[PDB]
Amino acid sequence: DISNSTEAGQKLFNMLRLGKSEPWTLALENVVGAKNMNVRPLLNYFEPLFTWLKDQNKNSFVGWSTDWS
């Protein structure tokens, strides 16, 4: 929760007040530090669920066969 944290407002207010005046990769970098959409942070979000799921699917067949109908 980013509330009450002013240094998290700067990192955001620097990307906002550009509109479209800059390439979107330069805008991204002003917040994240990279130049491309990354799928790593989406996987840190669902970590405590991924663990639990890997534990719940012990006795099942993770995957699917594309011929049953």
Partner 1 sequence: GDMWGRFWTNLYSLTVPFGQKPNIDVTDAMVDQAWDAQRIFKEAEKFFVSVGLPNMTQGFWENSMLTDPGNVQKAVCHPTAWDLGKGDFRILMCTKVTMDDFLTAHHEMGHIQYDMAYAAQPFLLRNGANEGFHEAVGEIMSLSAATPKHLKSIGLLSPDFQEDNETEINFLLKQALTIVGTLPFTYMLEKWRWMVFKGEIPKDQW
Ligand X SMILES: *[C@@H]1O[C@H](CO)[C@@H](O[C@@H]2O[C@H](CO)[C@@H](O)[C@H](O)[C@H]2NC(C)=O)[C@H](O)[C@H]1NC(C)=O
Tell whether residue 3 is a contact of ligand X (CB under 6 A).
yes
Contacting residue, 33, 44, 49, 64, with partner 1 by CB under 8 A: 49
Q: Which residues of 14-39 are buried (b: 16+ CB within 10 A; e: fewer)?
A: ebeeeeeeeeeeebbeeeeeeeeeee
Number of chain positions touching partner 1 (CB under 8 A): 28
Report the residue number, 38 or 51, with the smaller CB distance to ligand X: 51
Contact call for residue 61 and partner 1 (CB under 8 A): no
- Cβ-based nearer residue to partner 1, 5 or 66: 5
The tokens describing 63, both together, are 């995957």
Confirm if 17 and 31 have CB atoms less than 8 A apart.
Answer: no
